[PDB]
Amino acid sequence: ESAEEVWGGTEDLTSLSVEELKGLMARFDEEEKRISYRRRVMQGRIDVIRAEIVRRGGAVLSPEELARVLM
Amino acid sequence: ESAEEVWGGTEDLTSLSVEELKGLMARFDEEEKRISYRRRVMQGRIDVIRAEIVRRGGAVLSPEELARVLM
Ligand SMILES: [Mg+2]
Ligand SMILES: [Mg+2]
Numbered sequence: 001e002s003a004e005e006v007w008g009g010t011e012d013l014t015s016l017s018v019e020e021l022k023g024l025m026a027r028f029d030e031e032e033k034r035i036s037y038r039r040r041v042m043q044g045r046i047d048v049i050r051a052e053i054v055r056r057g058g059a060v061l062s063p064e065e066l067a068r069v070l071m
Numbered sequence: 072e073s074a075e076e077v078w079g080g081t082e083d084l085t086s087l088s089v090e091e092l093k094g095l096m097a098r099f100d101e102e103e104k105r106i107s108y109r110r111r112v113m114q115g116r117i118d119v120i121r122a123e124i125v126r127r128g129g130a131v132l133s134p135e136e137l138a139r140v141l142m
Contacts, residue, residue, distance in 0.1 A: 007116065013123050018131050022142045025120045029140040032113035035106060042103035045078065049096040052084050059089055069100040071093050 003027035074098040 003024050010016060016024075050066060053059060058066065065071060074095050081087060087095075121137060136142070 013119065016123070018124065018127065018129070021120050021124050022132075025117055025124075025140055026142045028113050028116045028120070032110060032117065035110045035113060039103065039106045039110060042099050042106060045099045046096060046103060048084070049092055049099070052087075053089070053092055053096075056089065069096055071097055 003031075 007024060077091065078095055124137065
């Protein structure tokens with residue numbers, strides 16, 4: 001019923017009607033956008049945090065640890 | 072106790088210890104990675120559906136409706 005279920009319960013792409021594919025695309029395009037928003041929020045948080053740590057002198061964290069988020 | 076709450080509840084960035092800074096960066100970084108993976112999955116699906124629709128033709132949709140996902 002949900003896009004996920006329909007998509008998942010399909011073994012053959014060609015069995016899907018155009019109405020289905022249209023509906024699925026819109027659904028996934030919608031989600032993709034909601035997911036990207038979430039990514040950007042995470043990136044912002046990571047961003048603010050890395051600047052705060054750098055502001056304090058980097059602690060004793062090497063530049064590469066800061067850039068790779070190894071901790 | 073969850074990162075979501077410690078972070079949502081912080082008024083002043085400078086009030087956060089360095090220990091908790093590192094914890095939050097670590098949590099959000101991994102979250103960022105998981106979210107990016109889903110994005111990529113969605114894009115993979117939109118890609119598969121868009122190819123399928125193109126393959127069939129039928130002028131069901133105009134090039135700009137396929138491209139902007141205007142159903
Ligand atoms: Mg920055
Ligand atoms: Mg393709």
